[PDB]
């Protein structure tokens, strides 16, 4: 599923990400934009052989099992395929764990390089929330 911008802002709000660990809604929408272009089916293989899954490109090296990332962990306790669903539950719940783990949203390189310190409220401007 490719979400619309305000459609995803709303879904992320309903799923509990507005101001989660202190990050406003616009930070999450910006990260999803640059991670996946709002596409729940996005996958991108990393040089280390791990793979990134979903709207927030959660990596199999730490967070999910895909059965093909030697030596990896599965800290969110899900199959990586769960992160590809039209329903963003598994992505949001795993992203909550990630953002809680010490480096906040810097875990998402694309947030750090493209959203961090910008006017992220622009990503929610004009959405019915
Ligand atoms: Cl594996
Ligand atoms: Cl933080
Ligand atoms: Na894994």
From Swiss-Prot:
Keywords: Allergen, Antimicrobial, Bacteriolytic enzyme, Disulfide bond, Glycosidase, Hydrolase, Secreted, Signal. Its EC number is 3.2.1.17. The keyword Secreted applies. It is found in: Secreted. GO terms for cellular component: cytoplasm; endoplasmic reticulum; extracellular space. In the egg white and polymorphonuclear leukocytes. Its main location: secreted. Transmembrane segments: none annotated. Monomer. Lysozyme C is capable of both hydrolysis and transglycosylation; it also shows a slight esterase activity. It acts rapidly on both peptide-substituted and unsubstituted peptidoglycan, and slowly on chitin oligosaccharides. This is Lysozyme C. The gene is LYZ.
